[PDB]
Amino acid sequence: TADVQQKLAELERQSGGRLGVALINTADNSQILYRADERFAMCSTSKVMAAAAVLKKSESEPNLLNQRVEIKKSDLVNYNPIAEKHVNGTMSLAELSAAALQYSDNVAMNKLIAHVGGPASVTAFARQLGDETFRLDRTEPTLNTAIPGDPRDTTSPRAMAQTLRNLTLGKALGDSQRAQLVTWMKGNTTGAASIQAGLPASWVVGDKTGSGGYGTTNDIAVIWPKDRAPLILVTYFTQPQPKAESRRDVLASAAKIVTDGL
Numbered sequence: 001t002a003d004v005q006q007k008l009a010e011l012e013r014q015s016g017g018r019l020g021v022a023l024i025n026t027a028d029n030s031q032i033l034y035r036a037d038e039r040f041a042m043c044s045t046s047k048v049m050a051a052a053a054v055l056k057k058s059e060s061e062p063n064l065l066n067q068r069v070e071i072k073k074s075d076l077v078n079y080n081p082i083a084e085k086h087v088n089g090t091m092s093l094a095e096l097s098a099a100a101l102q103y104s105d106n107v108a109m110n111k112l113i114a115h116v117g118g119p120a121s122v123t124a125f126a127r128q129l130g131d132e133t134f135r136l137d138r139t140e141p142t143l144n145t146a147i148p149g150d151p152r153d154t155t156s157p158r159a160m161a162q163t164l165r166n167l168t169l170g171k172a173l174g175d176s177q178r179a180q181l182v183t184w185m186k187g188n189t190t191g192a193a194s195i196q197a198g199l200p201a202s203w204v205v206g207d208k209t210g211s212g213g214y215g216t217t218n219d220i221a222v223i224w225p226k227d228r229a230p231l232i233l234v235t236y237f238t239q240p241q242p243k244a245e246s247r248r249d250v251l252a253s254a255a256k257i258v259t260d261g262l
């Protein structure tokens with residue numbers, strides 16, 4: 001409706017930044033879109049695609065998720081809450097996937113990237129899903145710079161919502177692998193202040209947040225509203241000032257606006 005559009009435009013104006021929203025309502029294959037074809041830096045929301053690429057690879061490599069990966073001091077980057085505990089030992093690729101998705105561990109993301117063949121291999125995976133917009137170009141920590149005008153490590157809200165639908169609700173992944181991705185995302189520990197904060201307490205959410213330079217504040221989610229078919233929601237947000245603070249409340253407000261009535 002124009003109503004939801006006016007409300008998102010007002011939210012964007014109040015926030016002072018640039019807001020991108022894509023909601024897919026699977027009850028009727030409908031969408032609510034706001035700047036949904038513009039590019040935004042994904043930041044840690046890209047961890048979903050890296051984990052999914054590993055899961056895809058595991059469909060033909062049944063030992064992949066159990067493969068042991070050494071964690072070294074030389075791997076630490078910024079923000080390694082889980083990997084720090086395992087320095088000089090190994091973690092399995094399953095453990096690294098869980099750490100990347102549930103604690104936003106950056107070392108874990110770098111190991112996923114390395115074990116599928118680098119950023120361009122994650123991008124090639126996206127192309128196999130029919131996503132010709134996503135691009136992963138750097139490793140952690142630099143993929144989060146989020147400089148205005150820089151297309152590196154960006155996607156659009158529309159593309160990411162469609163891809164998330166395919167990964168979590170469709171059959172881009174096999175039965176076991178899709179269930180694993182959804183279980184990992186439902187177990188996220190870092191998302192309560194973002195999309196979830198704009199939804200009723202009873203709704204079930206699997207999400208992945210991200211943040212970065214220019215006050216970039218993001219969340220992507222699969223949502224099961226009480227007694228309704230699932231939704232996919234992408235909320236991306238970025239600001240004009242390099243040192244702007246995160247605005248998770250803007251994502252919560254966007255979620256409340258677009259799910260009002262559901």
Ligand SMILES: *C(=O)C/C=N/[C@@H](C(=O)O)[C@](C)(Cn1ccnn1)[S-](=O)=O
Binds near residue numbers: 078141
């Ligand atoms: C996922 O979104 C991980 C984001 N990490 C960045 C952040 O939280 O802002 C870090 C910690 C800080 N940063 C801002 C710009 N470039 N980096 S990045 O160092 O991991």
Ligand SMILES: [Cl-]
Binds near residue numbers: 199200201202
């Ligand atoms: Cl409630």
